[PDB]
Design a protein around this nucleic acid. Structure first.
Ligand SMILES: Cc1cc2nc3c(=O)[nH]c(=O)nc-3n(C[C@H](O)[C@H](O)[C@H](O)COP(=O)(O)O)c2cc1C
Ligand SMILES: [Mg+2]
Ligand SMILES: [Mg+2]
Ligand SMILES: [Mg+2]
Ligand SMILES: [Mg+2]
Ligand SMILES: [Mg+2]
Ligand SMILES: [Mg+2]
Ligand SMILES: [Mg+2]
Ligand SMILES: [Mg+2]
Ligand SMILES: [Mn+2]
Length: 311
RNA sequence: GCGCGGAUAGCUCAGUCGGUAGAGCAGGGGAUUGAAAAUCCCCGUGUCCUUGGUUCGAUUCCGAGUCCGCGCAC
């Protein structure tokens, strides 16, 4: 039966939003924003700012497990930073092989799958054996020709599981190009679990994805902001969160403190989440207009909190 | 002169469809020391090369300019 992962989303799904979402969902796991590794062991404070859940045994307050993601190339430094992530409490570690476009990392590793093998292998070897080492890949740089070589590099590295985002790097976030079929081909070749990713917005689209890919584990990104209870919609075919409950969730958000807030976190992030929500809720367009021009946190917090959920 | 790619803190670098830039090192302060170094605590406010524009909001998108690297006009 079905696993649903919350995707890593740099600048969107930080610890606050992971707190808020996990409370009203049944996500099986969340991935952190990437920790960017070059050629040094990063200090403890970087891992704690990216993953505050490390001080709660790698769990959000409602209890959902969280896993730190690394983005980088050099095997020695991926290994040292992976070991630190798990020593700090991370429930395994994830390698990013999908980020666009320099120091090597993300999607660039997809041009030479040997680098995926070396990076992931060194990670697997530095992390205690029963903690998961996952890798998240796109299908290729500007084509899908190497997708089997990529998947095979991850498996031969000894990785626990592979998430496949069903697009090349050059295909971006374009909907017409999603290739759940290719995820399925990859799933049939590998012995390790393959988790499908891309263009899951609701129950029906998750059913289509699982039917076509053959996966019963999926990862959801953008759709998890559009519809804040998407995991339950997808798993149990519940209705999308009603608009008054979405507004209550945003109110809660405005009451969470962001560590190191340079002053405009809620201005930024309330407006950002609203731009996702208006793809789905007519009501989010009105609310976005009402807060559009508020340019400080006191003002936006006061306006969001003043909305009467009963009216 | 023409293409393509660059320009982020004193230096080396990080920076996901636009959401408010942060590590390491140097450096400054504390502890420590006879005084230092090393170690532990603290300092991360940059016209994001300059400029105009779009936008509620630009390192990011658009125009202009400069400088740098590569390969084509002397
Ligand atoms: C704003 C944004 C930030 C993202 N940041 C990351 C990231 O930090 N790491 C990563 O592996 N993928 C990242 N992704 C990719 C997503 O995890 C996911 O693979 C992609 O959005 C496709 O899934 P979706 O159609 O369900 O959104 C990001 C995507 C978006 C839109
Ligand atoms: Mg962003
Ligand atoms: Mg825009
Ligand atoms: Mg010093
Ligand atoms: Mg600053
Ligand atoms: Mg400018
Ligand atoms: Mg204006
Ligand atoms: Mg401007
Ligand atoms: Mg524009
Ligand atoms: Mn950069």
């Amino acid at each position: 039966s079905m696993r649903v992962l919350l995707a890593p989303m740099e600048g969107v799904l930080d610890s606050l939003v992971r707190e808020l979402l996990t409370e009203v969902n049944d996500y099986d796991l969340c991935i952190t924003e990437f920790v960017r590794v070059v050629d040094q062991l990063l200090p403890v404070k970087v891992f704690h700012r990216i993953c505050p859940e490390l001080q709660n045994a790698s769990r959000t307050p409602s209890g959902t497990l969280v896993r730190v993601q690394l983005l980088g190339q050099f095997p020695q430094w991926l290994a040292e930073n992976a070991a630190r992530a798990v020593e700090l409490g991370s429930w395994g570690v994830d390698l990013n092989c999908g980020a666009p476009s320099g120091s090597g990392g993300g999607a660039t590793l997809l041009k030479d799958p040997e680098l995926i093998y070396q990076g992931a292998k060194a990670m697997r070897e530095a992390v205690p054996a029963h903690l998961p080492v996952s890798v998240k890949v796109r299908l290729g740089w500007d084509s899908g020709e190497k997708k089997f070589e990529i998947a095979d590099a991850v498996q031969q590295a000894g990785a626990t599981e592979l998430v496949v985002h069903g697009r090349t790097k050059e295909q971006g976030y374009r909907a017409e190009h999603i290739d759940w079929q290719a995820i399925g081909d990859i799933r049939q070749r590998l012995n390790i679990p393959v988790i499908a990713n891309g263009e899951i917005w609701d129950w029906q689209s998750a059913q289509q994805c699982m039917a076509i890919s053959g996966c019963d584990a999926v990862m959801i990104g953008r759709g998890a902001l559009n519809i804040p209870n998407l995991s339950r919609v997808v798993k149990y075919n519940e209705p999308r969160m009603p608009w008054p409950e979405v507004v209550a969730l945003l109110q809660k958000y405005t009451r969470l403190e962001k560590q190191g807030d340079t002053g405009l976190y809620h201005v930024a992030r309330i407006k950002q989440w609203l731009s996702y929500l208006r793809k789905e809720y007519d009501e989010a367009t009105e609310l976005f207009q009402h807060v559009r021009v508020l340019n400080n946190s006191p003002d936006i917090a006061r306006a969001i909190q003043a909305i009467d959920i009963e009216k």
